[PDB]
A paper describes a structure:
To parasitize a phage, the SaPIs employ a transcriptional repressor, Stl, which in addition to repressing the SaPI genes, senses an active phage infection by binding to the phage-encoded anti-repressor protein. Here, we show that the phage satellite SaPI2, which does not encode orthodox anti-phage defense systems, provides antiviral immunity mediated by Stl2, the SaPI2-encoded transcriptional repressor. Stl2 targets and inhibits phage-encoded HRs, including Sak and Sak4, two HRs from the Rad52-like and Rad51-like superfamilies. Here we have focused on two recombinases, an annealase called Sak, and a recombinase called Sak4, belonging to the Rad52-like and Rad51-like superfamilies respectively.
Investigating Stl2’s oligomeric state by mass photometry showed two peaks, one corresponding to the dimeric form (54 kDa) and a second peak of 626 kDa, indicating that Stl2 displayed distinct oligomeric states in solution. To further analyze the oligomeric state of Stl2 in solution we solved the apo Stl2 structure by cryo-EM. Surprisingly, the micrographs showed circular structures as well as long curved filaments, highlighting Stl2’s intrinsic tendency to oligomerize mimicking its target’s architecture. We generated a cryo-EM map of the undecamer state with C11 symmetry and discovered that the circles were composed by 11, 12, and 13 dimers of Stl2. We extracted particles with a smaller box size so that three complete Stl2 dimers were resolved imposing D1 symmetry at an overall 3.7 Å resolution. Notably, at the interfaces of monomer-monomer and dimer-dimer contacts, the local resolution improved to 2.5 Å. We first analyzed these two mutants by mass photometry and confirmed that they displayed only one peak corresponding to the dimeric state, indicating that they had lost their ability to form circles/filaments of dimers. The Stl2 apo structure therefore suggests that its ability to oligomerize into large multimeric structures is the basis for its promiscuity in targeting phage-encoded HRs from structurally divergent superfamilies.
Author numbering:
A (entry chain C): 1 to 76, 106 to 121, 123 to 130, 136 to 146, 148 to 185, 205 to 218
B (entry chain D): 1 to 88, 92 to 133, 138 to 193, 203 to 223
C (entry chain E), D (entry chain F): 1 to 196, 201 to 223
E (entry chain G): 1 to 86, 92 to 130, 139 to 148, 150 to 189, 191 to 193, 203 to 223
F (entry chain H): 1 to 73, 90 to 99, 101 to 102, 105 to 124, 126 to 147, 149 to 151, 153 to 181, 183 to 185, ...
G (entry chain B): 62 to 78, 80 to 83, 103 to 109, 120 to 122, 140 to 144, 155 to 156, 161 to 166, 168 to 177
H (entry chain A): 15 to 16, 18 to 20, 22 to 27, 50 to 56, 58 to 60
Write the structure that this text describes.
Amino acid sequence: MIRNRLSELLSERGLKISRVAKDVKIARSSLTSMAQNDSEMIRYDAIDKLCSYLHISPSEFFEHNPINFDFTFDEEEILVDVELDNRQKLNFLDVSYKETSQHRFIFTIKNDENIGLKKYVDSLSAGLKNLLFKKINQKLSGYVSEIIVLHKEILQTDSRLSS
Amino acid sequence: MIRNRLSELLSERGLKISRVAKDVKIARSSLTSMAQNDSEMIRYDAIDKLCSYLHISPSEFFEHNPINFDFTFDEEPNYKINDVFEGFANITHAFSIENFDFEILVDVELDNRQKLNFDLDVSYKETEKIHRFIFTIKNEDENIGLKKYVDSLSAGLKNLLFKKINQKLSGYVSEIIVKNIDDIEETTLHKEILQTDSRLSSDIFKE
Amino acid sequence: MIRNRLSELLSERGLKISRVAKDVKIARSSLTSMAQNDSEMIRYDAIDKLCSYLHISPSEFFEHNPINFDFTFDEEPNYKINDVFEGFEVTANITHAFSIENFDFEILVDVELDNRQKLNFDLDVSYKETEKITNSQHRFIFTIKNEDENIGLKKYVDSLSAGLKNLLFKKINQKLSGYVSEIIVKNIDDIEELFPKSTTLHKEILQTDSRLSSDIFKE
Amino acid sequence: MIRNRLSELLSERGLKISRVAKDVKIARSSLTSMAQNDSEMIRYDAIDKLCSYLHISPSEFFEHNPINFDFTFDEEPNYKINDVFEGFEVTANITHAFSIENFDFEILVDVELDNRQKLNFDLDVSYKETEKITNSQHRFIFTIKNEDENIGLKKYVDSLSAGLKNLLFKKINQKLSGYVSEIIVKNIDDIEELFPKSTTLHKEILQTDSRLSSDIFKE
Amino acid sequence: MIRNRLSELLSERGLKISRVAKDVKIARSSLTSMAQNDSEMIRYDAIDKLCSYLHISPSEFFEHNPINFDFTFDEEPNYKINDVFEANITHAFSIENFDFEILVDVELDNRQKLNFDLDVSYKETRFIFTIKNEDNIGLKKYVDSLSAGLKNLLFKKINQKLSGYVSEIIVKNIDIEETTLHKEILQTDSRLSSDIFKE
Amino acid sequence: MIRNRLSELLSERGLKISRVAKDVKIARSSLTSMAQNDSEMIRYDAIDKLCSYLHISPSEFFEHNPINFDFTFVTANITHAFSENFEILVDVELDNRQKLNFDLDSYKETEKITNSQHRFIFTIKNEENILKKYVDSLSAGLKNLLFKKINQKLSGYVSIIVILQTDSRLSS
Amino acid sequence: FEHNPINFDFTFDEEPNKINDFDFEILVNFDFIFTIKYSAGLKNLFKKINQKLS
Amino acid sequence: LKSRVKDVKIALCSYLHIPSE
């Protein structure tokens, strides 16, 4: 669980993406992608150029939490595996379709044994939780569209969870 | 100036590339390079995995100093190459250089926007055999300000800077040399020139 | 900023363009271009002849202010274009061919002083209305949407003289004209008139020019 | 006469051509051409950048003198050329290909002062010998015949400064070399060597440059 | 400014082009053309025969004055022509406004050269033009100095050149055949009427 | 008999043909031809520009005399090419209409000062010493012009032979 | 056979060295005849390592 | 324990503490 903090810092200091790109000589698209926790790799040069410009040590740019989450699906259930440190691996479910520019199916988990999992999710900070929420949805949405298969409308459609 | 400070941590811990490779499912080949500070891009999954396995925080997996050094090489160098047919593996048998002088422009940007500027001049000295071309700066008294800035850095950053500048110097010399030398069939002469490297020795960059 | 004070000198001394063009042996077209500041490169011989004929040292021929403004426009703007079918073919009129709903983009200005320090101001521009200068030509009129936070730019601009401010005002408008026209031409294709010397919509929209009225930038 | 004083300023301030080119974002070739006076047309942006970077007004960037010299070469000279045979092919030594017996031409100099009145001085030049200063490149030497009846021209030239005098000398020699090389190449055809990178006689003679050495036109 | 004085001499003597053409054996057309000061070249042979026949010195034959007038016409004129679709030139084309600048460069006996500038505007219809600024009085003071004959020659030169600039512009801008319109305008002339060049 | 005194004026004032041509904007060849009394027709513009430049009235430019004269008729070496042995009817029409008539009648010898120029000396047989008094009164320039004209015309007639470069001399 | 409450994980290096016309790292958490607490029936796992080297 | 019994690393005796059955 790791995330950038560029989005916030930029909001706090009042600077807009446009100036940041011109001053640090980095393409707008890459800088925009790096601020939403989308890119998978962060070029070292980018970290040094930004840290120098925003006058911040790399302590602020990166936010880390040792707790990790593992998700597993079959080819036929969201098998989350809270994996805290000390190799204290744990296991936690069943979700079923409930109801249906933005088409969104609201699948809903329906199961008094999630009390430990809910406590674990509550501990994560706002940004990491938002990353976790985006990650769980992205994974399921990728898998769900496979069942439906010109314009590939299903690809644009995503899934949703609630609990 | 940013480095990854992986090797240091691993040594004090007492582990080895081999163990970590499996303990955290990271290709042995990649985990090797990322330890020599010589990989352009680092992924996030690596950061979290390594930070957790060694119970550390990102703050100590990175070292950052505001000063940045940029190196622009000369476009018109004064060089004489004397094709020697006798002898050709030796390199000295294939070609020797009477002279080779070019100008290095170094720009040092401090924390404050202030952009101090320094100028350097380099000259061919001799050919040692570890072969390795050796180049030495001419003026180190009119340009001592650069030396003060280089020493203010830590050991790792200085080592990285030295690795970078030496590689860049090797690039200009090897590329310029390959253009005015006739290739001879054997590991051809051109291939031997490419593998060759050059080192700059001075008080300003002692290590 | 630098300019050729040829026009002011010619106006003051009372000479006309033809008399000078014939006497110093420089071609009229080139001389009348150098009267304005459209020309990019000037020849040494022209400077020598014009300085000798008018009894002036090169100090009075050039006026230089150390300040230097830079202009860069937003790469990804917001534009809304509605196709209008009101019989453009019969009469070549801008309003008939199309209408503009909303046009928003960012203009970043980077005032650089004589000192090595560099300031930074931002400007937001919006479309207001199209106007009729001649019954054959029109000029779109935009307006800056933030003047309470950019009083500095007004303070620095007013430090210039009349000619250099005229030169700057021409530069910003000319750059705005090309950028706005390029977006419209890329978005909408061309239509030719029914009765032809025939002029298409692309050429007509390329010839037209924009303007950026604002309390800060005038004259 | 007018010249750009970039070289003297760069020498005085201690800066070097490489540093200036990187700082003002101008290609080194153009800047080193502008260091001399070979360039004919210069850009406004170059003037602004170089004046801003060096903290100088344009009054110091240009030096101007109202005087103006115009040289018109004769259209009918007397050329005496012998096609000496000495195996030029073995070694490209110009003197082997040919020798000059007697080359005489008339140079008409008009000196236009700041006042509308103008004077007129006439000069006669003759061939003498070949300097052979460099084994690869030889320079022809010509001397002004009448110096006693043209003393007035010397008085006027000495009123100019060092740089403008240098510029004047560069012009008379460059034009004299073009007039001579053109005449010589018109008289004799070309011969090429078998063993090269091969250079013909035409190309070698065009490369060869002359020089007019006399007290009036010193330095 | 140089003119031949043959026409004045023949009238005072009492002869006529017809008589001389036979006495000096010179073609009648050539002799009568050389009599109107409008031939570009005079042959050496002609001077000796005529000088001997009239018992006159060459100095009497030629009249010379140092002042030289050079006229340069504008290259960008304000021409506005109203086309009429109903030969009489007044029916083909009618001129609204035709304004251009004439630059005059009087060269005195001394090397010093004075400069005067004149503006010319269309008045009515021989397309008669007139000069806007007559005060530019320095040019007039000099025209008066020229003798009676030389002044007439200068007036003829300006009138012919004016026709050149005008006719060309009009014919090169307006289209017709019924001696067509084009063959009429080129023949049409023009005259600059004002006190400065009064004849 | 009419000639222009440009050459004498240029020699007297010290000016050279090169400078005069540039100042008066007249081609060098035309001015050179005019300065040696060769061209047949001349322009008014040249007369005015030259007179103003030299500050001279046309009186000095032209020299005229009413007396007129009328005439009526193995190797590349010219001498070896051909190989044994005409009368000239001259008049002296005076200004008073007192026309007079003179008769002069063969090849005497050939003299070539140089290989480049061959001259045939057609000395006159002296068939009227009164003609000679008339030629004497003339000035130097007009007499030289008369010599040049008669030599040119008679040489042209003799080059009968058809070689062209060679010129015939009628001397006495 | 005998239920074993212990299983072993062995992994050699992927880059061994020596030839003429051999030191490697075995991963088990602990770390020509090549030399260097957990019934003798099963112990005879030893058999698997034998085939591993050759 | 069902897909859930992954921990076996197979697309038991020491895993569920059961030759036994």
